[PDB]
């Protein structure tokens, strides 16, 4: 269907304990394929998915170069912004960036994004029209100016429309046997008696991809209220995901309850029972 490639930058200052550490991860869809950590003994961009390993030495030399240059730049960002806000020399401060591009089923650019964040809050983002900036505050507007006068937006649009999309398609191509494929959840129900009067019914979905999923409990064919105990969808470590949903039920009325699961990898919604 539709696909995305995204990069996540993070710079964290550590006053009186070294220079700010810089970390980056690349994703295509729900699949990380790339990483960089400036505290690594030999800071290099590194493969976290099979279909990028094939890339040539020129590629990696290039990516590592950007990462090292990004750590330098973001370190300035931290120092520059720290001044704007006139903050104490006390504790740590953060500068994040997320950028990338979405391509539709046809394979054309749906939209580009390039957001920045200071201390975990929106700071300045490139607008969906890839031409103007949105400043969140007094400081960000100073930054806004600098970028307008320098023509930063145009350069960003170049990469987002062109380079970003090209790479994305290439990766989709080179890693099609896993990127294009959806894995169905393996579902089951567990039975955890609370007391002689109540029991917990927990509905598991395991080993699925991508992470988007829907679990739900019904009684007699109608929804539950109230209510289902979820857990946030969590990685298994093997590139698939996990989720469960539980309900307390009258000890003896287990039959009234069915679990309902919907996921891309299922030809059709599934219905489980105890």
């Amino acid at each position: 269907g539709s696909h995305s490639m995204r990069y996540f930058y993070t710079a964290v200052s550590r006053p009186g304990r070294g220079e700010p550490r810089f970390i980056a991860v690349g994703y295509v869809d729900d699949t990380q394929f790339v990483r960089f950590d400036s505290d690594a003994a030999s800071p290099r961009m590194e493969p976290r998915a099979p279909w990028v390993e094939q890339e040539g030495p020129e590629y990696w030399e290039r990516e590592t170069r950007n990462m090292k240059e990004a750590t330098q730049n973001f370190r300035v960002g931290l120092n520059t912004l720290h001044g704007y806000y006139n903050q104490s020399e006390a504790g740590s401060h953060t500068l994040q960036r997320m950028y990338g591009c979405d391509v539709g089923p046809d394979g054309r650019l749906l939209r580009g994004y390039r957001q920045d964040a200071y201390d975990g809050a929106d700071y300045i983002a490139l607008n969906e029209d890839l031409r103007s900036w949105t400043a969140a505050d007094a400081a960000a507007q100073i930054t806004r100016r600098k970028r307008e006068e320098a023509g930063e937006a145009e350069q960003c649009r170049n990469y987002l429309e062109g380079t970003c999309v090209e790479w994305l398609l290439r990766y989709l191509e080179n890693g099609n046997e896993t990127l294009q494929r959806a894995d169905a959840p393996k579902t089951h129900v567990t039975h955890h008696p609370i007391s002689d009067h109540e029991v917990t019914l927990r509905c598991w979905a395991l080993g699925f991809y991508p992470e988007e999923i829907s679990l739900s409990w019904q009684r007699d064919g109608e929804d539950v209220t109230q209510d289902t105990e979820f857990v946030e969808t969590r990685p298994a470590g093997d590139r698939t995901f996990q989720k469960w949903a539980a309900v307390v039920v009258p000890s003896g009325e287990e039959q009234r309850y069915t679990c309902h699961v919907q996921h891309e990898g299922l030809a059709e919604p599934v219905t489980l029972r105890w």
């Binding site: 550590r14 950590d37 740590s92 975990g120 929106d122 567990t190 969590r234 093997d238």
Partner: protein, 99 residues
């Protein structure tokens, strides 16, 4: 503003006593990104513990995954221990096989 980290502890595959598996400690929703995570077997630091890469989400909050090989049993307990600026005390969550 500091966001307290949320923790989930769980295995990669369904738990079968004596059967080699992978234990996961999933830590999310925290800020700042500085964090100390360790995993305990019975209450003692586990030597080899893998640490995924610090990434973040739509709301800017960070998340990371810790994990190590392990073989579940009837008696052995397992736990995750997290030290973060947002908390005065370290936080410990024990692995529950039904969750």
């Amino acid at each position: 503003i500091q966001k307290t980290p949320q923790i989930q502890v769980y295995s990669r595959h369904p738990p079968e006593n004596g059967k080699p598996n992978i234990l996961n400690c999933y830590v999310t929703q925290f800020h700042p990104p500085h964090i100390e995570i360790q995993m305990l077997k019975n209450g003692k630091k586990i030597p080899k513990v893998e640490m995924s890469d610090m990434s973040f989400s739509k709301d800017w909050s960070f998340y990371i995954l810790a994990h190590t090989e392990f073989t579940p049993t009837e008696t052995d307990t397992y736990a995750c221990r997290v030290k973060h600026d947002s908390m005065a005390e370290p936080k410990t969550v024990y692995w529950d096989r039904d969750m």
